């Protein structure tokens, strides 16, 4: 858990009809993938 996470949660709460852009920042598609000497472990989502 990170401090940026302690803030992310709150930013999701303020999604509470006329919420235009606003919906583009509500979610995102992210896939991180480690790497080795290049080789790379299994790609998971955020």
């Amino acid at each position: 858990i990170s401090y940026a996470a302690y803030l992310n949660v709150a930013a999701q709460a303020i999604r509470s009809e006329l919420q235009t852009s606003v919906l583009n920042r509500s979610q995102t598609d992210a896939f991180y993938t480690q790497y080795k000497n290049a080789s790379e472990p299994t790609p998971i989502t955020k």
Partner: protein, 268 residues
Amino acid sequence: ATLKEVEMRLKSIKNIEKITKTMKIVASTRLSKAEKAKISAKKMDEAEQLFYKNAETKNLDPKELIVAITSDKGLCGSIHSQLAKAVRRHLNDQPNADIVTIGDKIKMQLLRTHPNNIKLSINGIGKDAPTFQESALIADKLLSVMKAGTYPKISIFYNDPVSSLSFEPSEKPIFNAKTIEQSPSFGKFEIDTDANVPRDLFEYTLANQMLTAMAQGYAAEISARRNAMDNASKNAGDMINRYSILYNRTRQAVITNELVDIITGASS
């Protein structure tokens, strides 16, 4: 030469002419969000860096974390070209470093020049305008799986839109918990020595400075994609019309040659 090959070749270029022009509009109509999120980020950037200025924070006196900021989408120009060189060229001085790459089209040049340096890569991000949640999560992994807090120096590489027709590879520093409280003019600000403020300040400036870098990074890109595809639709013009003439030069020659055999075989 073929009756048809010059027609279906004219088709795979006639529709390529509109497609590059249809994405030029997408990039040109999306420049509005680009020129806004750019100013919003920068304004928060000033608000965020003013503390780092009045506190006179600077890197301590061989690890360093490098973050590459670009997209996975091509058709944008030399934005993935010049930025990757700026990184490589900065990497030459200090080979001792780990590189986290955001976007795959930046992972390209780095896999070639310095394949082992890449210890982490983010996939499928550069398509929309960046968001805090996106960056805050990238920093959360950067902090966890990479342990950025154990690094003496952080460097974010991004693209800065100097002009609306040209971009500019740039670099910004991120200072860790230890570098913040050990700042010369850090006592200048009253801070309770218990609520781990310096620690929370780094984990928070890690996400923001990324978004600020992304905002300008994906803004300089959209501004470069419009340019990249305005030259494309124009270049598709010297094709749709060039081969257009060649189609007719073939159509007239088809009707004549098709008619000669008839007249020749009618004389008997």
